Amino acid sequence: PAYTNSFTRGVYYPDKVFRSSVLHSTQDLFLPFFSNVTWFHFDNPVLPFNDGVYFASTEKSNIIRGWIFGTTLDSKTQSLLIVNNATNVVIKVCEFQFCNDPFLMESEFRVYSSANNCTFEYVSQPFLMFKNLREFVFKNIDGYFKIYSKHTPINLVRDLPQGFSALEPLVDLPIGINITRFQTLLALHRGAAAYYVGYLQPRTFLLKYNENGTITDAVDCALDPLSETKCTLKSFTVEKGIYQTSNFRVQPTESIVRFPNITNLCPFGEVFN
Amino acid sequence: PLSETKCTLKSFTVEKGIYQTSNFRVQPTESIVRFPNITNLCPFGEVFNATRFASVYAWNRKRISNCVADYSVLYNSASFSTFKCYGVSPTKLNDLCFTNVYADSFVIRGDEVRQIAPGQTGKIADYNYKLPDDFTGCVIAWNSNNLDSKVGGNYNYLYRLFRKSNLKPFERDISTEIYQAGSTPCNGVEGFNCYFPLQSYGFQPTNGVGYQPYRVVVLSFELLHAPATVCGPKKSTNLVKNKCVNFNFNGLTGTGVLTESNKKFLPFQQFGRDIADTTDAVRDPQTLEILDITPCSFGGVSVITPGTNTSNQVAVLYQDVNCNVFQTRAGCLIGAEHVNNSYECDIPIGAGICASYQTSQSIIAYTMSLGAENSVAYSNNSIAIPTNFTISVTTEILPVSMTKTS
Amino acid sequence: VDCTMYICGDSTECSNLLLQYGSFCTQLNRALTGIAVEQDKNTQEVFAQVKQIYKTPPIKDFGGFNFSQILPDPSKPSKRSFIEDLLFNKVTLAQKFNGLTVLPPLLTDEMIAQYTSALLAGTITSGWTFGAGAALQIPFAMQMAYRFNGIGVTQNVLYENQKLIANQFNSAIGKIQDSLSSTASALGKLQDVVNQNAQALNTLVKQLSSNFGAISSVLNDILSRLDPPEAEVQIDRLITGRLQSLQTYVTQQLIRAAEIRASANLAATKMSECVLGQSKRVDFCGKGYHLMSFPQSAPHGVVFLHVTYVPAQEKNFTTAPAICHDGKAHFPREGVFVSNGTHWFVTQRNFYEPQIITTDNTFVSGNCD
Amino acid sequence: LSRLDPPEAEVQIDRLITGRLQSLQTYVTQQLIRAAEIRASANLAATKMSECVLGQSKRVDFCGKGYHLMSFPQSAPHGVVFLHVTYVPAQEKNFTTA
Amino acid sequence: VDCTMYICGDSTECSNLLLQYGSFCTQLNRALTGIAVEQDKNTQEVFAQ
């Protein structure tokens, strides 16, 4: 439903260790280029993780008020909170009840359902104050939680802009609630939304850092047999020729086990009967 | 310098020609220290055991920067027992300066300290707390037995217990009904196969040492991609040029001369490297200038020889050492009376410069020579006729077979 | 390779694990620096077949033959030459850091060209006399004429066609920078032999991210994180793969190393024959009958310029290998007989010019039939 | 194998046995490009082995510098010790052509 | 000759320890594949006449 081309985005640093102008490779998880993406809007249904999230918001809107990263929607499977109180990134980690559809002359405070069992409260500088475009990266294996974004005004209000851009380490968090599913957060004042959620999986990249230590290009080791060669000559531009790069075979399916003919006939059972 | 390849071939005799030595930099002097000026040493009250570091599903976040990072200001504030460091040295931390640093608190159970690790398998692994394998930092638990142990069972934190499948690595999760694993769904009525994951603790000091909680800090820090000023407390010196000294610019050491440039470096980007994997442009965070690390290793040496048993005076070819000296073109030629004559070659230097031992006397070098370029008869009506003989031969050896191998 | 700082680097106990232990990196040096003297010796006899500069004469008035592409000229820094100006920006490349070094060559790139500047002079000045010894005079026009008698070309024709040879020779010389002014892949064998060293250096350095059974890839963590009277075992295995990677690098260099000399002895021999002496052995220096060459400089090689006598515009003439006249045979001194269907004529093998059947051009023997 | 135990000797044996025949690897490479240095010097022996020796052929700079007379061969390994008599004239006259 | 097919086969932990060595595999191919163009250029330079 509402598939769009995942062109170029979905990058991040593995960590910040210094290397510049050097085509470097790791084994991490990244966005498959030229894949689908979930364009969801009036209606905000629940979404399973599905082994992948690359969130992207829309412009023309300061309406999105965080996320519902989810399991089941009441108070029984411990909790998050990510909002903005129009001045600060308010992160409660409080246990709020069944706000399956929380919404907000300032109308707010429907999401506040059960203020009990608060065990972290947070206030910092806000994530974001032709409009800035938010994109985010959302995962879990042994430790923490990311916040990775960059915001740029552009045209093409609904569809994904092309062009390649890095993402940045902002805000990193050891919380502790391993994930099934998710859902968004928005507001109202007294629901016509748009956003994107991607998918990443383990896949080798080759990364370009610039003359200054910043991402400007990357390639994928499974998109085509072309970049496979780029994945094994450690370079972008290869020369007219032929390059043995990798190998294949046929996987096994049945995995039979065959043994000699049966009935060597222990008379063990006669003493039981 | 003539006696420098007797031991390279490891023998008490050296031959004739031109040899090699050890290396050539130019003699080093000093070791400058450059740190940015942040007055703040980092306060460690509300990260390390102040009064309350709450849930296993809720950590006390503080964005930690704009202070000077140091590692020996922890052990006072808590009762530490375990230090477990990855991606980094445990004690080279004031020998460095990081970028985008964190100090990150949480709490574990005492029977399952073991699988707080990048992927030990068991019941520790799909319902809480999860980060990829590429993490640089320390893992620090400590003793605490006073405040988090009541007389009636600890009902101060939830933990989520159920989840279906797997993930990518790094996030967090709210939503919160009765869990569904298989058939007979819930829809908020709590039927069968609708599990109740919020299940009572028993953390008490009367319960054993394996049944205690353990508050854990896991340190988190990274080396030099954003411009940062977090640098450690080993205070500052002056700044020098035209020399090869030890420095430390924000966490990357090196070996090279700082020379000036003129380029328009984009002013939010800390360091850089050129085409062949070496750091070309270094930022200092005080004066806002960009220096170029010209690699101070530059130089080659040679030595013109006849040997030891024959003599003990030298002719020099300091090749890439700038300069009785003379200057020919494969190097700086000392030990060498440069003469103005021309003879045959014994020890070449280059561009037709050869050295030899001729006529107290010293080894001399010179420019070589072809022979008699003359002007003999060009008359149109002549041709040249040789007729005499005093016979011998012009020899050469020529090789037929040689050795085989097995 | 300075061995210990490649293996360990600035550490006592890592070196003090390396000394129950004979002379590996001793003999690895004596492997490597043993080859290191020899490429300079390979540089030695590949140009130094003369014994100083022949100075080219200041007047350049050689019979109409232009030479403004191959002499050096003081427009550049007095030593490089005109084709070489196009050359030395067409081969572009490691660094100096941890582990390694780059010694300079023996001769410098300014004075590699110095011998070449010498060699072009005498072979314009005196010709292959200076392969022998003292060199008599010769003017260039008649030498070329005397040069054609090597391949059976009757040497009147060079006097007889002096002007037509000129511009064909000249524009062919200007064509060779035209053959390389745009781009060629034919720089080729120069370009990779530098390049395969660089990746070899790069695949030398990329080894040092190894773990090889250890819990690290840096040295000092093994000092820090565990105990030096037990964690020397963690050093102990980390030695040997680095020793192996050095062992491979000395090896895989050495195979290519004297493979270059085995190519270079062929290179100096063509410098020996086809620069000095107007050889006879066909298909050996350029496609066609050999005439002379003119060598230039290179970053690590040599580029020859050859000149060949290529026939063209054939016209088949009726022939017969024998003439009988008063019962006796008549055989040509060289060449064969031809006729234009009407009258017979005498010419040489490789250029058409008829003459008249005389007593001179032939000799007799034997009976007829 | 005896003192070190095969769990923590296996990363020691990892590049002990795998590295030892990397040292006649040294030797044969040292052998053959002395051997092929003579296997082509066989051909360089063959340059003036027979040509200006069994009889006479007529190549400049392949019968020695000079117009050649003959030979008388004798025994050697990496050898047969020629006397290639090549006739470089020594002293120079003229006679005046017309 | 493959690196991985010659060492490993139906295993992963074989190849997982091999990824510590990882330069050694692509070391060997550029050796061996270089022989392949070496053999071809020989067959070229003999009979491309």
DSSP codes joined into one string, C124-143: HHTTTHHHHSS-----HHHH
Q: Are B226 and B245 in contact (CB under 8 A)?
A: no
Strand order in the sheet with B353-356: B337-338, B364-367, B353-356, B347-350
Q: Are B144 and B156 in contact (CB under 8 A)?
A: no
Q: Which residues does chain A have within 8 Å of residue E5's beta carbon, measured at their own beta carbons?
A: 247
Closest residue in chain E to residue C216, using alpha carbons only: E20
* C14: its two tokens: 């890592």
| A93 DSSP assignment | -
Tokens 């002990």 belong to residue: D16
CB contact under 8 A, E31 and C203: no
- CA dist list (Å): C271 to B52, B353, B368, C278, C294: 86, 22, 21, 12, 9
The whole-angstrom separation of Cα C33 and Cα C254 is 11
**Which residues in C have their CB inside 8 Å of a CB on B?**
30, 33, 44, 48, 50-54, 93-97, 101, 103-104, 106-108, 110-111, 114-115, 118, 130, 133-137, 205, 220-221, 224-225
Judge whether A247 is closer than 8 Å to chain E, CB to CB: yes
The whole-angstrom separation of Cα C14 and Cα A250 is 47
Q: What do you get for the CA distance between the two ends of chain B, in Å? A: 42
Cα–Cα nearest to A84, from A60, A105, A108: A108
Q: Name E47's bridge partners.
A: none
Question: What range defines the domain where residue A34 resides?
Answer: 3-249
Q: Are B69 and B319 in contact (CB under 8 A)?
A: no
The whole-angstrom separation of Cα B215 and Cα B49 is 8
Helix (H) or strand (E) holding B82: strand B79-86
Q: Are C280 and C290 in contact (CB under 8 A)?
A: yes
Tokens 């598939």 belong to residue: A3
Please give the radius of gyration of chain A, using alpha carbons only, rounded to the nearest integer: 25
* B34: its two tokens: 């450059």
Residue B102: φ, ψ to 5°: -135, 155
Domain containing residue A215: CATH number? 2.60.120.960
> B272 in helix, strand or coil?
strand
Q: What is the least distance, in Å, from the CA of E23 to any CA of chain C?
A: 7
Q: Please classify residue B48 by burial: count the beta carbons closer than 10 Å to its beta carbon, then call 0-12 exposed, 13-18 middle and 19+ buried.
A: buried
The whole-angstrom separation of Cα B176 and Cα A95 is 8
Q: Name A194's bridge partners.
A: none
The whole-angstrom separation of Cα A14 and Cα A27 is 9
The whole-angstrom separation of Cα C150 and Cα C147 is 6
Q: What share of chain C is helix, strand, coil (3-state, %, to 5)?
A: 45, 10, 45
Chains that touch D (3 or more CB pairs under 8 A): B, C
Burial call C325-360: b when 16+ CB within 10 Å, e when fewer: eeeebbebeebebbeeeeebbbbbeebeeeeebeee
Judge whether D13 is closer than 8 Å to chain C, CB to CB: no
Q: Are B38 and B68 in contact (CB under 8 A)?
A: yes
Query: Which amino acid appears at position C274 of this protein?
Result: C
The whole-angstrom separation of Cα C277 and Cα C132 is 10
Q: Which residues does chain C have within 8 Å of residue B295's beta carbon, measured at their own beta carbons?
A: 95-97
Cβ neighbours for B105, distance < 8 A, ≥ 6 positions apart: A174, B47, B48, B53, B59, B60, B215, B216, B217
CB contact under 8 A, D22 and C251: yes
Q: Is A257 inside any structural domain?
A: no
Which residues 7-26 of B are in CB contact (within 8 Å) with C? Answer: 8-9, 20, 23
Please give the distance of CA A90 from its chain centroid, rounded to a whole number: 22
Which residues 185-214 of B are in CB contact (within 8 Å) with A? Answer: 186, 188, 196-198
- CA dist list (Å): A194 to A58, A61, C183: 6, 9, 52
Closest residue in chain D to residue B401, using alpha carbons only: D78
Q: Please classify residue C135 by burial: count the beta carbons closer than 10 Å to its beta carbon, then call 0-12 exposed, 13-18 middle and 19+ buried.
A: buried
Residue A121: φ, ψ to 5°: -130, 140
Cα–Cα–Cα angle for C152, C157, C160, nearest 5°?
Answer: 170
The whole-angstrom separation of Cα A122 and Cα A18 is 31
Cα–Cα nearest to A38, from A48, A25, A28: A48
CB contact under 8 A, B397 and D84: no
Q: Which residues does chain C have within 8 Å of residue B20's beta carbon, measured at their own beta carbons?
A: 33, 103
Q: Is A205 inside any structural domain?
A: yes
Q: Is A83 inside any structural domain?
A: yes
CB contact under 8 A, E26 and A244: no
Judge whether C152 is closer than 8 Å to chain D, CB to CB: no
The whole-angstrom separation of Cα C209 and Cα C201 is 14
Cα–Cα nearest to C240, from E28, E29, D17: D17
Q: Which residues does chain A have within 8 Å of residue B99's beta carbon, measured at their own beta carbons?
A: 16
Cα–Cα nearest to A176, from C354, E48, B157, C66: B157
**Alpha helix (H) residue ranges in B118-276:** none
Chains that touch C (3 or more CB pairs under 8 A): B, D, E
Helix (H) or strand (E) holding C85: helix C82-87
Helix (H) or strand (E) holding C269: helix C232-270
Q: Are B180 and B193 in contact (CB under 8 A)?
A: yes
Judge whether C207 is closer than 8 Å to chain E, CB to CB: yes
Of D11, D26, D40, which is closest to C212 when you measure between CB atoms? Answer: D11
Cβ neighbours for B313, distance < 8 A, ≥ 6 positions apart: B335, B362, B363
Please give the distance of CA B355 from its chain centroid, rounded to a whole number: 44
The whole-angstrom separation of Cα C358 and Cα B357 is 67
Closest residue in chain B to residue D78, using alpha carbons only: B399
* B252: its two tokens: 């990357």
Which technique was used to obtain these atomic coordinates?
A: cryo-EM
**Alpha helix (H) residue ranges in chain A:** 225-233
Residue A16 CB-half CA count within 13 A: 24
Chains that touch A (3 or more CB pairs under 8 A): B, E
Helix (H) or strand (E) holding C309: strand C304-309
Q: Is A256 inside any structural domain?
A: no
Q: What is the least distance, in Å, from the CA of A166 to any CA of chain E?
A: 28
Judge whether D34 is closer than 8 Å to chain C, CB to CB: no
Please give the radius of gyration of chain B, using alpha carbons only, rounded to the nearest integer: 39
Q: What do you get for the CA distance between the two ends of chain C, in Å? A: 81
- Total residues belonging to chain E: 49
- CA dist list (Å): A138 to A29, A174, B35: 11, 13, 36
Cα–Cα nearest to A99, from A119, A136, A58, A70: A70
Q: Name C305's bridge partners.
A: C294
> D34 in helix, strand or coil?
helix
Cα–Cα nearest to B401, from D40, C42, C134, D52: D40
Chain D meets chain B (3+ C-beta pairs below 8 A): yes
Tokens 């964690």 belong to residue: C231
Please give the distance of CA C357 from its chain centroid, rounded to a whole number: 47
Residue B74: φ, ψ to 5°: -105, -45
Q: Are B366 and B339 in contact (CB under 8 A)?
A: yes
How many domains is chain A built from? 1
The whole-angstrom separation of Cα B349 and Cα B353 is 5
Q: What is the least distance, in Å, from the CA of E48 to any CA of chain C?
A: 12
Helix (H) or strand (E) holding C243: helix C232-270
Cα–Cα nearest to D66, from C124, C146, C277: C277
Centre a 10 Å sphere on the Cβ of residue B263 and count the other Cβ atoms it contains. 7
Cα–Cα nearest to B165, from A201, A93, A3: A201
Q: Are A185 and A99 in contact (CB under 8 A)?
A: no
Which residues 67-86 of D are in CB contact (within 8 Å) with C? Answer: none
The whole-angstrom separation of Cα B212 and Cα B109 is 6
CB contact under 8 A, B171 and A138: yes
Judge whether C211 is closer than 8 Å to chain D, CB to CB: no
